[model samples]
Target: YSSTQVLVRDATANDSRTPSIDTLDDLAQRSYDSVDFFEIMDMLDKRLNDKGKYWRHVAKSLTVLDYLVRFGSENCVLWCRENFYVIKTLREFRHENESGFDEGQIIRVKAKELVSLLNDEERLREERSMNT
Candidate 1:
């Protein structure tokens, strides 16, 4: 049995410091299955395209994308295929306001990596001739 299932809180109330890793780690390890693939993909899409927000959220999206690709249920890949168009934009995501923390570079490389995986899946889909 798991002991002391940790909870998360918004530190934004204290100060607008860069987002901590607690939430990301918690969600990645324990809360991963708590959310659906559609929700996950939706957030990634919106955050990637969002202009005013910091780069951290987009980084989080790439983290989540990798998690979903590796450990997510089968439907995860299907949803990702549907979102391939925008997801590929990760290759060109800009670091406009990423002066404070260089999370953008972290996001960029991982984004390209995930994009590569998606492209691989696309090729497999074609070779197998399966719609799923």
Candidate 2:
């Protein structure tokens, strides 16, 4: 098989409705650790509605994840993660703005407050890494 096959298998095995991770690296690691079919399906469905034009990528990611879970491998999982994130991020962006909120206005009002936590976490990680 390929590397993707291995990744899929591992990811499927560790799939969870609420995946818990201690860090970005942990999240990346768990993405390869198990397959959470429900989580994938939920995300797929949401993304499909959020951006119908991008359903193909979500469908493909779901297929790869399913294959990896059944076949037992990490290869396909890795590939899906790399590509799916793009779609996922795009979907998130769409969802964030779907309220018909004005572009710059929404960004100025909600984006900063909502993304602040993520930014803080990233900054903390960078600071710790620099110190280490």
Candidate 3:
């Protein structure tokens, strides 16, 4: 990052190195803690925000969601939760101001259905595993 640097341990026989951001405490003036989340959101937001206008970020979200669903992976839930607000707002705007209203509505419906199915299934999975 422009203002940050990261340090990581080389993975040994059992584990992989985790990606991270290292920070310095100005008050301590010498050492800083590794805070991985700090730079990630800033960097990811800018890229996706830029992509929103040039393409169907919503469509991309739905695509990822579908792939996650077809395999019954939990990742779809995470992706959907993160993009939930932005997609709705953008769709609302496009509905009034653009010609892609039908596409927007379709994506929204699919997102909703994906979320409902994931929630019910994940709950069932956890409950079933509780017997273990």
Question: What C-alpha lDDT do the candidate models reach, one value each?
Answer: 0.53, 0.35, 0.36
Model 3 TM-score, 2 decimals: 0.36
TM-score of each: 0.58, 0.23, 0.36
Off by over 4 Å in 2: 1-23, 37-132
> What local lDDT does model 3 show for residue 59?
43
Measured with C-alpha atoms, the lDDT of residue 49 in candidate 1 is 62
Clashes of 2: 26
Best by TM-score: 1
Comparing 1 with 3 on lDDT, the higher-scoring candidate is 1
Best by lDDT: 1
**Distance (Å) between predicted and true CA of 57, model 1?**
1.4
Full candidate order by TM-score, most accurate first: 1, 3, 2
How big is the positional error of residue 113 in model 2, measured in Å on the Cα after superposition? Answer: 23
Global Cα lDDT for candidate 1: 0.53
lDDT (Cα, 0-100) at 106 in candidate 2: 26
